Structures are given as structure tokens and as C-alpha cells.
Design a protein around this ligand. Structure first.
Ligand code: MG
Ligand code: MG
Ligand code: MG
Length: 86
RNA sequence: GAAUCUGGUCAAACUUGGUCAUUUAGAGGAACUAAAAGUCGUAACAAGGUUUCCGUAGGUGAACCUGCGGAAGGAUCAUUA
């Protein structure tokens, strides 16, 4: 019950994808994605993987930055958000 | 014929405003250049993998994309009768 986990999916070379799993569905997700895009400039998209819920995918190694953003805006704790690293 | 004195006249200056010029602190904001082992793509150069440009309008994360009209600086100097 509500534990946000951010992970890298390793792609070709140094280019990667960052998946945000278990996002709270309180604020508008598309809007959030747009904001993220505006911020650090990474091509964001929303994926619904076999009812895990709503997964935000971003380009590169936006993990720490994402966490910071969450802290600033919607995320309250630092604790229920875990950042993996693969 | 001195002080003094009535009007002028030239007129420095002074009080409060306004104005033009040049400076000058300047919370913040938006730039461009330089250095070009950061990040996201790959827009352009080959038909650059949707031919490029241009005017213009809209849209976007970012190169940009998409209308409408145009230009080869195009990948065509080419289909008689
Ligand atoms: Mg290209
Ligand atoms: Mg092209
Ligand atoms: Mg020229």
C-alpha cells in the first residue's frame, strides 16, 4: 500500500530509461510529466504495465532529480520513495 | 559737496517647483559570447534515411514538426508526333 520505487532500465551504452513505479494518483500525471520535461529536458511518456498502475518513463539518469522534484511538490516523506539504481 | 534717499537699468545670485542632457547605486529578469571528456535526443550535410530552403501562421522538451504559397542553392536542363 503506497510505496513509490524509482528504477533505471539500462539501454544501449550510456543512454538509459528511468521508470517511476507506484506514483500517487492525486495530482494530474500528464501535467507532472510535462513539467518534468520542461525542467531537465527528457522525452517523457506514460505506460500502463500489466496493472501496476501508472508508470512515468523518462530519458537518461533522472532519478535523484526526480526524487528532489517529488520532495519539492507532491511527495511528503523521503522514506516511502525508494531510488534503486540497478 | 559726503552720508543718506526716490525711481530706473544692467543684473550676479537665492527659495520652491518643472525640464533636457550625462552620469550613478540597482531587489530582480532576459541575453550573448568564451571554455567545449556533463545531460536528452539526432535537426542539417548522402534522396542524411519525411529532399532541403523561404515567407507566414499554429503547435511543441529540444533540436523541430505541420498547414498555405513559393525557390532549386534538387535527387529532374529529356517524351517527339
Ligand atoms: Mg537527421
Ligand atoms: Mg531530412
Ligand atoms: Mg550562400
Amino acid at each position: 500500500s503506497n510505496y513509490i520505487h524509482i528504477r533505471i532500465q539500462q539501454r544501449n551504452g550510456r543512454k538509459t530509461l528511468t521508470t517511476v513505479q507506484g506514483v500517487p494518483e492525486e495530482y494530474d500525471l500528464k501535467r507532472i510529466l510535462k513539467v518534468l520535461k520542461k525542467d531537465f529536458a527528457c522525452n517523457g511518456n506514460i505506460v500502463k504495465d500489466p496493472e501496476m498502475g501508472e508508470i512515468i518513463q523518462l530519458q537518461g539518469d533522472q532519478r535523484a532529480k526526480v526524487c528532489e522534484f517529488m520532495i519539492s511538490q507532491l511527495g511528503l516523506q523521503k522514506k516511502n520513495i525508494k531510488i534503486h539504481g540497478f
